[PDB]
Amino acid sequence: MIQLFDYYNQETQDLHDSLLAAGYACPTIVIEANGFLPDDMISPYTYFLGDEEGVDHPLFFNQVPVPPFWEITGDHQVARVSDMGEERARIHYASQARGRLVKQVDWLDKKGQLRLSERYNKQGRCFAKTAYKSGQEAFNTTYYSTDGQERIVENHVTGDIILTLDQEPLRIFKSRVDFIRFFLERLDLDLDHILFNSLAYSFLVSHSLTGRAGQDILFWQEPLYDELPGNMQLILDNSQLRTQTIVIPDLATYEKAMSLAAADQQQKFLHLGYHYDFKRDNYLRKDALILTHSDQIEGLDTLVQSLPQLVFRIAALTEMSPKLLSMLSYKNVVLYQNASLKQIEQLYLESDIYLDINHGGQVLQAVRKAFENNLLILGFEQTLHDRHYIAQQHIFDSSQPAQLASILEEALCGVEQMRSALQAQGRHANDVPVSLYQETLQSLLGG
Amino acid sequence: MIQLFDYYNQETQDLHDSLLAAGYACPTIVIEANGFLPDDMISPYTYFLGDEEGVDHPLFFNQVPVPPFWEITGDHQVARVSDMGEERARIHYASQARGRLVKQVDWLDKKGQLRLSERYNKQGRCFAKTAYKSGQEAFNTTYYSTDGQERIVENHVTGDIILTLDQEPLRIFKSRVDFIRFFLERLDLDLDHILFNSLAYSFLVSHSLTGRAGQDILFWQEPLYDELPGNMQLILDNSQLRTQTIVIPDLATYEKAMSLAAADQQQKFLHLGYHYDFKRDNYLRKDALILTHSDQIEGLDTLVQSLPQLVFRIAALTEMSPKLLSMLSYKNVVLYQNASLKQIEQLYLESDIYLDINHGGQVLQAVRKAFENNLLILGFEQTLHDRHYIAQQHIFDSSQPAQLASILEEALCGVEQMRSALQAQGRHANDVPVSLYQETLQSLL
Amino acid sequence: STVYNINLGIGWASSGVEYAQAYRAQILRRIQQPAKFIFMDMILADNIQHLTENIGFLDEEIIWLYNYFTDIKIAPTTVTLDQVLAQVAGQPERSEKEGKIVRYFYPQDDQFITCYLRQEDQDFVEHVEYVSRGRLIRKDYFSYVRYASEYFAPHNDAATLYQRRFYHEDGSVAYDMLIEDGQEKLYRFPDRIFYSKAELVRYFLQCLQLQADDVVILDRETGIGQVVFEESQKAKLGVVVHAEHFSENASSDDYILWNNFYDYQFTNADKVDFFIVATEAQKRILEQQFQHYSDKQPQIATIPVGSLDQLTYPKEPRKPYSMITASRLATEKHIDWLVAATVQAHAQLPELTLDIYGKGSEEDKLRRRIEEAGAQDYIRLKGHADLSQIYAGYELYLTASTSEGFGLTLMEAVGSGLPLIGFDVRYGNQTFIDDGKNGYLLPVSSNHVEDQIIAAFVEKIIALFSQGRQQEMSQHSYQVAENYLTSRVEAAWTQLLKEVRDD
Amino acid sequence: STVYNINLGIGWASSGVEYAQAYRAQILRRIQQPAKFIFMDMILADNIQHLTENIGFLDEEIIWLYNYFTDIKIAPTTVTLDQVLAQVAGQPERSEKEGKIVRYFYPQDDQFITCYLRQEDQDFVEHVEYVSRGRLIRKDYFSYVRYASEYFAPHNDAATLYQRRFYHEDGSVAYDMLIEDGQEKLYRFPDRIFYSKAELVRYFLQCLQLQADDVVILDRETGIGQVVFEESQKAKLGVVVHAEHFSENASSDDYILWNNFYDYQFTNADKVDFFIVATEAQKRILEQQFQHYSDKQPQIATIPVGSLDQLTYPKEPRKPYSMITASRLATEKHIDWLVAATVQAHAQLPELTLDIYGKGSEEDKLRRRIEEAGAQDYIRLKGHADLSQIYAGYELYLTASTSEGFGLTLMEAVGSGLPLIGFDVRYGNQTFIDDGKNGYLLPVSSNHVEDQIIAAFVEKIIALFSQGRQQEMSQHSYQVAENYLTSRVEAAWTQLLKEVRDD
Ligand SMILES: [Mg+2]
Numbered sequence A: 001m002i003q004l005f006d007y008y009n010q011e012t013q014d015l016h017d018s019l020l021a022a023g024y025a026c027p028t029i030v031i032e033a034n035g036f037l038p039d040d041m042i043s044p045y046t047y048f049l050g051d052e053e054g055v056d057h058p059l060f061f062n063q064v065p066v067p068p069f070w071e072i073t074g075d076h077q078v079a080r081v082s083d084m085g086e087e088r089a090r091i092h093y094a095s096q097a098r099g100r101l102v103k104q105v106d107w108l109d110k111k112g113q114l115r116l117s118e119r120y121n122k123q124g125r126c127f128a129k130t131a132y133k134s135g136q137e138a139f140n141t142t143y144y145s146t147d148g149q150e151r152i153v154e155n156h157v158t159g160d161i162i163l164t165l166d167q168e169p170l171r172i173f174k175s176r177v178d179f180i181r182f183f184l185e186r187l188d189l190d191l192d193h194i195l196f197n198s199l200a201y202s203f204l205v206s207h208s209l210t211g212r213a214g215q216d217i218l219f220w221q222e223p224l225y226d227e228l229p230g231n232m233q234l235i236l237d238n239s240q241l242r243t244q245t246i247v248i249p250d251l252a253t254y255e256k257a258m259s260l261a262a263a264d265q266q267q268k269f270l271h272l273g274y275h276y277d278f279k280r281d282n283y284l285r286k287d288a289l290i291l292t293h294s295d296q297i298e299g300l301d302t303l304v305q306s307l308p309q310l311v312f313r314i315a316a317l318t319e320m321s322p323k324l325l326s327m328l329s330y331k332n333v334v335l336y337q338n339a340s341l342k343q344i345e346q347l348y349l350e351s352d353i354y355l356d357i358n359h360g361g362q363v364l365q366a367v368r369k370a371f372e373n374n375l376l377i378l379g380f381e382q383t384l385h386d387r388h389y390i391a392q393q394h395i396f397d398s399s400q401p402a403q404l405a406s407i408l409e410e411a412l413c414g415v416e417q418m419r420s421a422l423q424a425q426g427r428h429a430n431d432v433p434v435s436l437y438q439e440t441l442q443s444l445l446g447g
Numbered sequence B: 001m002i003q004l005f006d007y008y009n010q011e012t013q014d015l016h017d018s019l020l021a022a023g024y025a026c027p028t029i030v031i032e033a034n035g036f037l038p039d040d041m042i043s044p045y046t047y048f049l050g051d052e053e054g055v056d057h058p059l060f061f062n063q064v065p066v067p068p069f070w071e072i073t074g075d076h077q078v079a080r081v082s083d084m085g086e087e088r089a090r091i092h093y094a095s096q097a098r099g100r101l102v103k104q105v106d107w108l109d110k111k112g113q114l115r116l117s118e119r120y121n122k123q124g125r126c127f128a129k130t131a132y133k134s135g136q137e138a139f140n141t142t143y144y145s146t147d148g149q150e151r152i153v154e155n156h157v158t159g160d161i162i163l164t165l166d167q168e169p170l171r172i173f174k175s176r177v178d179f180i181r182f183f184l185e186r187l188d189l190d191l192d193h194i195l196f197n198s199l200a201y202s203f204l205v206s207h208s209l210t211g212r213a214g215q216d217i218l219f220w221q222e223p224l225y226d227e228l229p230g231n232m233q234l235i236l237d238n239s240q241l242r243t244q245t246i247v248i249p250d251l252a253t254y255e256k257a258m259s260l261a262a263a264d265q266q267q268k269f270l271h272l273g274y275h276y277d278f279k280r281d282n283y284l285r286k287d288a289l290i291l292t293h294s295d296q297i298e299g300l301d302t303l304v305q306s307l308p309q310l311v312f313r314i315a316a317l318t319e320m321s322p323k324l325l326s327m328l329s330y331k332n333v334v335l336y337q338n339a340s341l342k343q344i345e346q347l348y349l350e351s352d353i354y355l356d357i358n359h360g361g362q363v364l365q366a367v368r369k370a371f372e373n374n375l376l377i378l379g380f381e382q383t384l385h386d387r388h389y390i391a392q393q394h395i396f397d398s399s400q401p402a403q404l405a406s407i408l409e410e411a412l413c414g415v416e417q418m419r420s421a422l423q424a425q426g427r428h429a430n431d432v433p434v435s436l437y438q439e440t441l442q443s444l445l
Numbered sequence C, D: 001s002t003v004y005n006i007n008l009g010i011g012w013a014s015s016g017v018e019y020a021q022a023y024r025a026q027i028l029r030r031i032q033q034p035a036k037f038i039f040m041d042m043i044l045a046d047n048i049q050h051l052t053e054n055i056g057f058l059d060e061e062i063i064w065l066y067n068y069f070t071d072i073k074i075a076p077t078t079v080t081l082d083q084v085l086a087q088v089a090g091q092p093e094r095s096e097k098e099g100k101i102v103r104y105f106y107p108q109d110d111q112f113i114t115c116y117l118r119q120e121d122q123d124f125v126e127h128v129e130y131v132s133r134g135r136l137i138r139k140d141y142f143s144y145v146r147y148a149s150e151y152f153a154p155h156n157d158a159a160t161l162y163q164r165r166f167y168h169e170d171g172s173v174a175y176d177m178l179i180e181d182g183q184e185k186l187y188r189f190p191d192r193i194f195y196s197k198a199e200l201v202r203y204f205l206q207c208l209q210l211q212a213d214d215v216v217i218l219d220r221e222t223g224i225g226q227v228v229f230e231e232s233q234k235a236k237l238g239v240v241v242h243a244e245h246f247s248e249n250a251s252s253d254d255y256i257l258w259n260n261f262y263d264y265q266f267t268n269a270d271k272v273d274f275f276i277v278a279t280e281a282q283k284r285i286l287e288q289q290f291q292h293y294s295d296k297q298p299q300i301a302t303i304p305v306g307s308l309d310q311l312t313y314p315k316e317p318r319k320p321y322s323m324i325t326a327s328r329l330a331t332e333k334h335i336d337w338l339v340a341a342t343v344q345a346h347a348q349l350p351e352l353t354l355d356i357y358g359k360g361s362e363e364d365k366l367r368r369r370i371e372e373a374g375a376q377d378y379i380r381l382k383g384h385a386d387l388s389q390i391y392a393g394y395e396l397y398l399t400a401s402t403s404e405g406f407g408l409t410l411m412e413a414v415g416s417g418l419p420l421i422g423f424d425v426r427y428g429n430q431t432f433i434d435d436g437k438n439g440y441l442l443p444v445s446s447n448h449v450e451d452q453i454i455a456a457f458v459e460k461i462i463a464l465f466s467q468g469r470q471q472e473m474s475q476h477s478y479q480v481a482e483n484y485l486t487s488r489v490e491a492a493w494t495q496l497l498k499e500v501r502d503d
């Protein structure tokens, strides 16, 4: 058994974490060249490079090696390399709880166009450089050993992948599918079942294995619209392919899927969800927690005077403009500025709501961390995503019913007044029991 | 009396050179800030900066002072300054026979846009820097005394000329017309009659004084088309403006200068030509001269078989392609390349018919130089400018047949027919004797 | 052998860095150590020399960047309207004087020259603008001659700066620059052309021809840090740290976030010969965060920003039971905790009173509650006073500062004699206080909880007002003050230059 | 201390500057002055070692710019077809061989590899192209390892070089570069990034770490001129003049037109420590043109490009009245006249005979002209030959070329005791022909008119073929040649570098 995921992201982590809870621990393959992979997983691009497993000590933005005397600077969202004030590179931040960790540094020419992308892993090493031709089109990507030798050269124009491993002769793979396939055979992975999350290469590995016997499941996590993706058809229309099963954790689209699938054609759609591991129960207490980058929180003044019983805690690791420092005039508000990670954890204990009221960009997956801590989330239509975790009943217009939160919010007056609400956002995120996997699967998962 | 000349060029030199033949030599002022001016002309922009008069020794292209170690390269056409390989400045050549002389240097920014124009003079100094704003639009020009002071700073957006002389208070003029008049009244020149060649700032300095004693003229040269400028119409209609008398030297510019205007407009504008100083007679030596920047000289393959009588002298200042040097083995052809400036003077003295048959860039005012020595000029319908000096009995077809091109002037063997062709040459150039100058102007003083 | 101090700019009202410099200049005189002070910004609003001299800089110590390329000298503006009009032509019909802007009209063709004067009463013109037909076309700046001017043109019907020229004593052009988008994009010398201010600054420091025994001290890095580092490698380079170098709320056991003004210098510390911190509390920890995080061991030296001239022993009666706070008033102050904890300490203590000197933002809300609170008449109110001598007429001092890099009022306070209570926070309260001995340092939690400290203020207030301590810890409060006074400053400042150059 | 000679390219047909450099290497060896010979061009089509060894350098003497940054030695290509096939996975079905190209096919995968050999009769492989589905995706370059690789991708169905990479002995990446329009626009090192080849050459010259008594000798300037000048100032810089250094026709008493290949070096001569010209004739000319046109007096030294190990005396035959010419026959060297000049001197003298050697373009036409005017084959023509042994067999050498900067033929001709007859023109003729002593210098007009040249040639062929004077000039070739022996050129080099190292 294997799980083969195109990309690594939270949607594939949730799918992966759920399956693992239900007793599915197989090897997991991410096709993407991602440099920060959970030790759980591997990738054919990063697998042969010689990095030491289980090391997390990435580069800090100012540890990027630069020409002598060149100046590294950066804020909380990005960084820069300069020669005499002239822009040279962009340092991009790996999105982690810890900030300013080096993911990818983008070198420029003197006219400012992108030329190289040098990629960093969780161990702080640079394992890949991407080279760009004229239009800022990707030419190729080289993957280096820890000794600086070419292990993988992937030509992006032709698709050809040149694989040269140590003390082995040179192998050319005509396509990404053919490379992954070499990787599966090379590791002698048991192919009973391939569970995969997309219609990209992770599918085309299955579609091209029909000669071999086994059956695979596709967990379809993306949105649906007027039609089906063309390829989501050939799994319904063809009867011989290794994958005859389409799991769709999001309900709302499962209905849209059943809508567009023909009456004969809906036998293949299984529906499921994810099993979240929540960190603690609610307790219905008095305290607000908002994470903002800067102001102003839409309708804070409105909500705060109207419900003076509720504690309001707002945090940032930036510093706060006196525009908001004006609002702590109230003894009703508590404000945390240049907030520590330690401090931001404490507030996720001491607050049972998260109002998604702020403007600008999101602060360290705050909407998610609220959901994992069973804080009831509400906001207006300008929400910092994810929309995954907030129920429709809970969302508001952009101050059209400016406050209608507050006493819909005030339905916090006791135990099953809430227990309703957190099954509302609990349902909307498609929370299911670990048992629901066990039932929904072993009708398929044999071998 | 004065000569107020908008621009220096040869149309002005010929007009200036002929009035001195007629004894009209007076102080002459060119408005244009021109650093290469003959020793007898001045400009208000040039005068107060203090370079020793009479010195003509410009800068060679590789003498432009540049930051330490920067490299200067160039060809006969243009030079440039480079830092570690990347273009920084353009070095533009003064248009003379002597090559690669620095009239102005254009510095660029690292993105290649034009920023400064440092303007140079005959005496080898940079007397002006022009600064540019974002659009590559000119902002101001500073003119400097030889010791580094500011003398003139002209604002090209507001026109405001700020003039600060040595020891003198600083003044602010509002226009070049105001500036020219200060210049005139300052040297206290006698404003009897102002002889001026265009309807630009010069004429706005005559229309300027209409209330003041003296009467002046225009000499109109620039070619004319469907109809008159509004500005010669200002003065044909008005009687008491100080210019009422317009002459036009080129007869192909005049027949029409009436056709458009009524017979009332008509007392006003006289007629003339230029009196050129020719350096020698023809002598009908059977020799031809061709000065080319690069081949191929149109249909010359055709002429040379047809004229074994004719020697064809082809000279280029650079090297030429074996494409042409293949023709040397035609035994009536001689070739001169890496042509020396002196060597090419000899050829002008040894040939009597100038074919203007080459393609592309012409060479050191070659047609004019032929006309100056009574070379007979025939060329094809690429008649490389000047067309000024070509009678049209003489221009020919653009090589459709080249057969008539020669039997025209193959037809000149003895002494009378040659003559008749060269006044035809001289008449289209508007050659008049110095006598007619004194006749048409004796009326006015 | 010289000591070149680098800073960006200066102004009439200016702040700790400039005074730490101006102060530093005065010691460096007394040692005979020659020193210049370089200022990189473009300062035409005032004449540069007025600002330098006010803060106490001698004209022979001042290197202005844009001046250095001229023969003109740093000078006060001596040029008079009389002299200014000798240069203009025509005659002015009518003057007009509004404050310092005085102007004369030349209406014949429509002109005027607007003059801006150093002092309203005097005649010394700082700069003049020439307007013709309503448009500014020229602006000249004066010291004892015109040292520069500006050329303008209409754009969007707004007067726009396109060019700025700098002159020698005789009016010959030294160099000039192009202005587009309010930035200096080109500099043209006779023999040089430069496309950025960064590369101009390099030329300037190469023209200084720094050598092995000269010392470059960088007090501000913005835009010049990289070029100063490269051209100072031949010489001795040093970086001074004003305020706090890191951020602990963003740091961890493996990852430290420097303050964005020292990051380049710390990152590149192998190019720096030595560092200067205000307090040895800062040399203490920054030495180890260099050890823990980066494994680099740069030399760090403690050299206070101020000094005490003389230990101030008062000859008057010590006034028993009083109070004061002198700080630059804002929210960061937090003396509503000093306001309340005085009410909450007034119940048990006779006739106590504090004075609040310094004024500014938030002054409104302190007056708001000090009246409705219990001791209204016995807590003070009004602002600025020069307390140079008046500290000693007091008992104790009160600081709620969450941060002080170096306390300067504190600096004066211990020399003047007061015991001291403040939170235990970097670096000033920690270097000026022991919690026996001088005073009490209040440990502070990670967040604002008001009644935490208001009661925690009162308890160390009264432990000293109880005998015999109040004068006990005052009188040895000075045995530490004997290290922070001038002779010891000049010792280490002196001390530092020699072990820097024996390298 | 070492001498660094800087050149751009080299090839199989390489000549001029390169043969001069090769013998400067041979000289500098005996003097025991250690030298490196630097090449800046990107040479992949042949192993640069094969080219340098072909002209006589030792691999220990060669510095190639792009190899310098690696740890790989300059070495001949020893990688073999077997070793190349050993490291490609699979086994090829079929082989193909066309000249030096040998292709191996892998139809199972639809890929083939194209090996380019060194010699067709050996198995050594200089390059391998990897073609996947008819597309060139990679190419390797071999000496004793893979030292470089190129990566392609089709554009308008043309294989296009986008990137080139250089490796260490152990296979690790040394650095790579980005190709755009046949230009290398970005160089990426681990610790560096460079945006132009000029700035790359700078880093190269810096990595050389030139000391004060190192000597940098500039053989060619184009593209590297300024950077070699900026970086050689800390050492002793010198510039060699290989051709005529100015255009005389385009000059005057007022203005001189330099040769563009020397214009930068001449204009900046104030930055040059010494020049080097082939002939003392040229030393004096350039010496004054300096004095006249721009007053400067840079040191100019005279070293010959060649030399004679010994003077070869004949085997005691000389064919009565026989001549010799050896040139690379082209437009410029105009042997047309002297095949036509002696046909009239065989009239005035019975036994007169001459013959032409040398090989090149344009005189396929010669073999036609030989006797098609009725001349007869007592004027023999011979092709290519190495002539060291063959000059002494004749009584007279002959040259029609209009310009020579030095001449290598004349030196060996004179070294065999052959008088010369050539035009009076700079330089080699004026250097090797002492007029009347060993030969006759023929004035030529500023324009080439023909019939007088031939007549002036034949007239001095009988004045050099009637009599008593020829062996009584063949003296003077042996007279001038002893100045040209190898032992005396070793002297001038040792002295020049000793002089240079005292400033
Ligand atoms: Mg640099």
Ligand SMILES: [Mg+2]
Pocket (backbone or CB within 6 Å): B083
């Ligand atoms: Mg430079």
